[PDB]
Amino acid sequence: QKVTQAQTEISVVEKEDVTLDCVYETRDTTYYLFWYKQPPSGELVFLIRRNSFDEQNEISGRYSWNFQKSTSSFNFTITASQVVDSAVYFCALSGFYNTDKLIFGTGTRLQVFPNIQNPDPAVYQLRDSKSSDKSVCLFTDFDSQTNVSQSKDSDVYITDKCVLDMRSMDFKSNSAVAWSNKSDFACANAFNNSIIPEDTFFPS
Amino acid sequence: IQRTPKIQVYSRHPAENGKSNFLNCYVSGFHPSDIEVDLLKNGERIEKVEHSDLSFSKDWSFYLLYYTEFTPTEKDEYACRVNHVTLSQPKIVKWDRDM
Amino acid sequence: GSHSMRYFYTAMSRPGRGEPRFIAVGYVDDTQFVRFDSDAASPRTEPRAPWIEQEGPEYWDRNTQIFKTNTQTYRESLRNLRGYYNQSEAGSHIIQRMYGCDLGPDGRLLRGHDQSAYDGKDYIALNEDLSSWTAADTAAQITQRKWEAARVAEQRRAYLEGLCVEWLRRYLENGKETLQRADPPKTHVTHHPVSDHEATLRCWALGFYPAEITLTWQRDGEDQTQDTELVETRPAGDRTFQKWAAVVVPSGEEQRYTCHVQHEGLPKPLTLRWEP
Amino acid sequence: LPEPLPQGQLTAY
């Protein structure tokens, strides 16, 4: 008995459709399958239960599932993806009885990046804390097509791209934070390891 | 409803005086399940009488087999004594080797 | 012929001191192979046929676990049904359950069954599609709704299409020498003088399996339906069955009468007369 | 084999 989720990470922009694959192997004639969602918050939330004798297709809003017994698959499709869908998704298989074991797949991470209508990439030096001793560089307002890479240096720390959502202004932006307490650390070379847009605004 | 038991008293094999056999009392068609069944020898209750596990027919009425091993003789007379809530009196059915 | 497996549950409450009693028995066709009774000091699932004895301890632990949990659930079901019918605690009540599978030509489920009764009357039954229920009365509809909400039909269908068939097939292989063998009746005709000028002819069928059999008397080819004394098929006590048919006939006219016997284990029509 | 217990609750009547 085995559940295989071959995909590790999937990245789409808002409104794009996405399919998460699940392949499984079973000795039992009779079994059921689960899909669970795990939002960044950490909890597990139930999405669907399909028994081996149930139907091929079902739609619950923007969610749909294709159960194909002959191919041993249970693909999960999200139509018109939204930032809210960002999570790890788990596929699961289990026999019908108390003695049977619920078996989980490796999970697939879905990231839904926002459609940045007016991109304005820039790297800013944030004013420190007059209490402690650090300097912070913020790379922000870039398109979702931009990828933030790791730092080559051990003492420079760079986060991955983070999705900001200003509710009342209907505005979404991307950002990544870099910091170091070393002398050589300037904002002009903080994101050198990443491929950044040509017209990135560097203030001085 | 409440259904009264049908009773059959018979042997496992055709009776042969001097040969080891089993004396059977089949009770069936009854509801509810509680039933008093005794096997008698010359008017006396036989001990060490076993019975089958309680089961039921398609119409939900119960049936049970009560049995004991015995050796028939010309002299000895056997019977089944059955009591049930539907019966105001215990029903005695004599063993007839030709039935 | 066409093979089947059936389990029979009886759960009975008593007004006197004591917890409700649960009894389960299992059958493959007309052969009992297993029993459970909650009344024993430490209740245990027990073998009732030799071909089941080969199953290891894990099988017996599994059976017992299932029946113990059923014992506790039925105690609650009995209270629930008392409430639906507005009955007092003074009476004794009985739930009966009968379920199992028939084997098809292709080795898959032909049909599943799962019927329950309360106090000897139909209560609720699983429909042939194994997705819906038929209730007998308004009280049973309360059970129906509860079971539809809890999606019990899916669970039963899982069993009736899955493990019921698989295990039946396994039992039929393990016990093939008896379970897949029909035993023809041993037949004979007895003659008992019932008065001066009449006599009873009795047609005996003994030691047959399965229980299904037909015994009919004829006089010169004509059916003696209304004059035939025909007893219900009874167990011999050794897993075979017995039956007899009798007619009262005028003395010296015994040759006119013929007994006819039909049974799976008989590949040809059988006709007997009394033989001096 | 009788109907085995479910993973969840065994439902009463």
Next chain:
Amino acid sequence: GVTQTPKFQVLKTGQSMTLQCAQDMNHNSMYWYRQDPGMGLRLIYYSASEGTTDKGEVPNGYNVSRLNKREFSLRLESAAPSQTSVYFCASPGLAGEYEQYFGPGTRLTVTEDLKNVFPPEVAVFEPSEAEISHTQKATLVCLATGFYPDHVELSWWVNGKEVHSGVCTDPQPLKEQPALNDSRYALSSRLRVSATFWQNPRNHFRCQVQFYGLSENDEWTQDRAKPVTQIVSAEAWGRAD
């Protein structure tokens, strides 16, 4: 549905601890899983009924106890760093839509020494004047650094009320020293407000980091303050500049 205690735990190598799982849906079956990044949920042990336990995929170093229908205990007899994980109790049924079949999970860290435990230092970095003039928006950055284990909950508070609008926090804490097993952690958060909202001196911005660490029962005889469960905060007021 199913409950779990505790939510967070720090243990020293060799020490014992028992995770509690409870379920009041009269389920027959209960399951313990561990989650590890990339392995998914792997079954440790399960229970088919009261007084019955069976081994899962990864039972090694664990024991279980099913004392009643309700409760299913997972014990680590001799804690090893490899048991650092997120643990999930499960009790699946047929009404997944109405009922919670997984507990909230417990985060457990087994470290080699309890003096490896450190609370976060928390700092707030004020928006650049360049961002304000260029985008008319103002991004505040919060930085929680130096903490171990990675048992933290970061939240933003504007004028005494917690905000989610305009907030981004890293998915997982970052290892400060990737080459070490006991590496202390860093976490970053951003809060983006409009320029005028930041330019109001009456507005008050607080980055709050809840840290779970040592409890009252733990021994501590070091110079530095016992790194107990605590809240560390940094704050800033609006600035017209």
